[PDB]
């Protein structure tokens, strides 16, 4: 069971997803992201039940990261399913933010609203060290 | 003295370019990028001499990464100033390509249309480690 979940939108966050799982690494902790461990099988029901087992939930909110979030009303967008699960669970949420407009709670579905609730990270591509070093802080 | 030079553009590679420091630098490579080694000073002189001084040309050629370079013919693009800096010095010039469409050489300022000589590398997603072990084959 990883202690650390990474939530992102493929088009635009794979880049730093995938900065992050690195320096996690590094730092001693277990990283799920699905390039490196979802493997075989049914992946819906493997996504939610490793979103479930992670102490920590690191979402990657890059440009129009939750946009096809929007009106998603049937829950089909898996950034908003991870969300969801995340907030069902009560998980340590750490939003990472780069380049990201925070959204008014109006447009997000009622069901991830509350993810503007929880105090996120800015990235800094000139204090990357300490942007690492303020992650690890936040996570258990 | 760095052996591998990060060229990138600031807007659209940058955190792969940072990905790429941190793979270079745990694989023992000495590595040059702005953010961590450009200090104090004429940064003019120290970019080109930072260019001159790694044996390696890195170039993190992102979406639309050249577009800048395009019509620069009094060389005032800093990409544009790096990469004919390399050709001028016969640096080993890896391209890293990361959803970066192929210009036409005639698009280009004819003082840097020779970086489509050099053989390039797919930056891959799903086989990251892969892609990162092909780049060291790459280094000298
Ligand atoms: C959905 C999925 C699949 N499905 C298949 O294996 C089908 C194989 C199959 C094909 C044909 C047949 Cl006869 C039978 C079987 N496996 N694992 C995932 C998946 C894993 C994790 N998360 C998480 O959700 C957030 C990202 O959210 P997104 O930004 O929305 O990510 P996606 O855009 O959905 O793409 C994500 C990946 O699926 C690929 N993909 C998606 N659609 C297409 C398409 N139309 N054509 C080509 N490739 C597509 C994409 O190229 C990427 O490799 C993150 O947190 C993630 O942890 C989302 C999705
Ligand atoms: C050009 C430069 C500066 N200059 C200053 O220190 C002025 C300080 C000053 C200010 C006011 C006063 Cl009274 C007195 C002094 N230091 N180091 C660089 C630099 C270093 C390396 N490379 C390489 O070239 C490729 C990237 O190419 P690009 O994507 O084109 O890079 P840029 O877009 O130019 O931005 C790169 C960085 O300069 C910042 N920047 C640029 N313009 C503006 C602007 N109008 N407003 C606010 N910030 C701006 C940007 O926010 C980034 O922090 C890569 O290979 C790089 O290794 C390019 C540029």
Chains 1, 2 share one sequence.
């Not at 590094?26 to 390039?35: E, K, N, Q, T």
Request: proline share 4%; aromatic share 10%.
């Amino acid at each position: 069971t990883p202690d650390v979940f990474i939530s992102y939108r493929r088009n635009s966050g794979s880049q730093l997803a995938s900065l992050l799982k690195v320096h996690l690494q590094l730092h001693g902790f277990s990283v799920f992201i699905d390039v490196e461990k979802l493997e075989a099988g049914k992946f819906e029901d493997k996504l939610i039940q490793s979103v479930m087992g992670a102490r920590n939930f690191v979402l990657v909110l890059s440009p129009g990261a939750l946009d096809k979030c929007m009106q998603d009303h049937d829950c089909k967008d898996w950034v908003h399913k991870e969300i969801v699960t995340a907030l069902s669970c009560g998980k340590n949420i750490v939003p990472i933010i780069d380049g990201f407009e925070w959204p008014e709670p109006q447009v997000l579905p009622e069901d991830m609203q509350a993810v503007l609730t929880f105090n996120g990270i800015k990235w800094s591509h000139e204090y990357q060290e300490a942007t690492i070093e303020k992650i690890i802080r936040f996570l258990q």
